[PDB]
Design an enzyme around this catalytic site. Sequence first.
Site, short mmCIF file in Angstrom:
data_model
loop_
_atom_site.label_atom_id
_atom_site.label_comp_id
_atom_site.label_asym_id
_atom_site.label_seq_id
_atom_site.Cartn_x
_atom_site.Cartn_y
_atom_site.Cartn_z
CG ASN B 190 30.82 14.35 88.59
OD1 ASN B 190 29.75 13.72 88.70
ND2 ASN B 190 31.98 13.84 89.01
CG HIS B 192 27.88 16.93 84.82
ND1 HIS B 192 28.11 17.50 83.58
CD2 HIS B 192 28.98 16.22 85.18
CE1 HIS B 192 29.33 17.14 83.23
NE2 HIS B 192 29.90 16.37 84.17
CB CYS B 227 20.00 21.62 81.06
SG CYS B 227 19.81 23.37 81.49
#
Lengths: 269, 268
Positions: B190, B192, B227
């Site tokens: 995704n 991330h 992050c």
Amino acid sequence: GSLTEDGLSYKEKFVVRSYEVGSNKTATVETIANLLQEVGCNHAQSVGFSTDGFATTTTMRKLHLIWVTARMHIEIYKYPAWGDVVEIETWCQSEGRIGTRRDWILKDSVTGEVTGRATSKWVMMNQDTRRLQKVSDDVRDEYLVFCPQEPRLAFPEENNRSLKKIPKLEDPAQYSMIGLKPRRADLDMNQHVNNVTYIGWVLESIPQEIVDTHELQVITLDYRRECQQDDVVDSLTTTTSNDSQFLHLLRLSGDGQEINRGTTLWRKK
Amino acid sequence: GSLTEDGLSYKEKFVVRSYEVGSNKTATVETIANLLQEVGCNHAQSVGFSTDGFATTTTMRKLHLIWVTARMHIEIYKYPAWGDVVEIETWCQSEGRIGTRRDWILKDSVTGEVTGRATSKWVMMNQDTRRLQKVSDDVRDEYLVFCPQEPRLAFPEENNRSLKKIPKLEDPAQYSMIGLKPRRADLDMNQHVNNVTYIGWVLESIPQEIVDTHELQVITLDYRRECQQDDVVDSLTTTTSDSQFLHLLRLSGDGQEINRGTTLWRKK
Ligand SMILES: O=C1NC[C@@H]2CCCCN12
Ligand SMILES: O=C1NC[C@@H]2CCCCN12
Ligand SMILES: O=C1NC[C@@H]2CCCCN12
Ligand SMILES: O=C1NC[C@@H]2CCCCN12
């Protein structure tokens, strides 16, 4: 994993893991590259050679000699999905006193169709001096019994992409990713920067728009020098091209010393 | 991999791969962390939940809600060698309206001895607003049937390391690794930044002489913020002592906190 019936090749099946897939739910090229390296290492273990990525013989260890990759070429037609079973077959062949070649064929276990293929050229060098050398007769004879004596090529074609000459990218590059540094996961069991890390670094300077609308079909990489643990690298890319093609260069962030050069070919998703 | 006889836990065996080992010929903590995540994902798949790392129910997807890790705690007694078979069992448990917990037990397949254990606390949040929420009754009822109803803890002992409070490292840090950036391999399906990447980043600021003469025994990590792909991080470490360290990950620019944690190392 096991050597095949004639003992001149090695096969192994892998089930694609959840953390091994990318934005498309299929295995990344770095997952594929690790699996190629894994099956190569399992092949060396099976016939008694070193398992440290150098695939050394007893004579080579006595002389502080190792095998190092000079060129890697991968071609993927279909990336396996999460949970799919991929079968990979690998073999080695001597190229006389020049060096050796390791080839791979990737197949879908369910259909038996060839989903990809790879080839690699390896040269011999003294580990300490880094000086290359032609393969000695004694070393050649230690390996030849583990190789098919009739040519067996993953890329048999006359003008195949695996043999294409790669030029040096000229400044200014169209795109760049600067200040890339390896972390401990990027090093192998001997504290050396893994060749799969360089594939990731080449791909960092490809714009995200290409990655989102295309799939990587071919990657050829010519290795010139090793990157140390404390080195800092810059990844440079210029478009050369239906399909998109790029020319790549990895060089030290400081003096601009060349580490790698390569080309990629992407197909619209 | 398969759910166990009572269907309230999931087991799977892994054969340690050549590229998964470190300078000591044993699996790295990042190999272990990926295997923990792999078996958690296979558990969610087996009972019909999402397989994207968010382990969502149909009700949660309708409401744009996800599970996110608040704390991860791992304890390794013996790292498996290249070619060894490691069996990992995992299960979830509700912690009422607070959130949920996933536990793991790692065993050597050959001897059956426990080579390690892990625990994780997860909180619910809207993926768009990033606002945390207590777990609704409807969501609780959807997964309680997949959990043991009697407590089953990987760390049952009162006053155990998995529950210790973690303070914020004060400047100047004893050691630091600055300007760490995630690459595409550091992102999940995704886009991330994978939790395992943060474990690698915490360990970057440990001096190489500790890594060479010691083995990591315990790592506890408290997650505060995500992050992004274009973020740049600084990893800070101070010795608190076996050797013990206090860690902090923060954005290279404004110093915004990303993570905090502690590690415990044993002489080789
Ligand atoms: O290291 C060497 N050199 C020749 C021998 C053949 C059997 C496997 C190990 N080998
Ligand atoms: O990594 C290194 N250092 C020098 C040698 C050149 C050919 C293959 C790659 N090599
Ligand atoms: O109620 C729900 N929501 C998603 C999950 C699928 C398996 C059966 C129970 N479930
Ligand atoms: O990653 C994130 N973003 C916000 C939330 C707070 C506590 C759990 C971890 N967190």
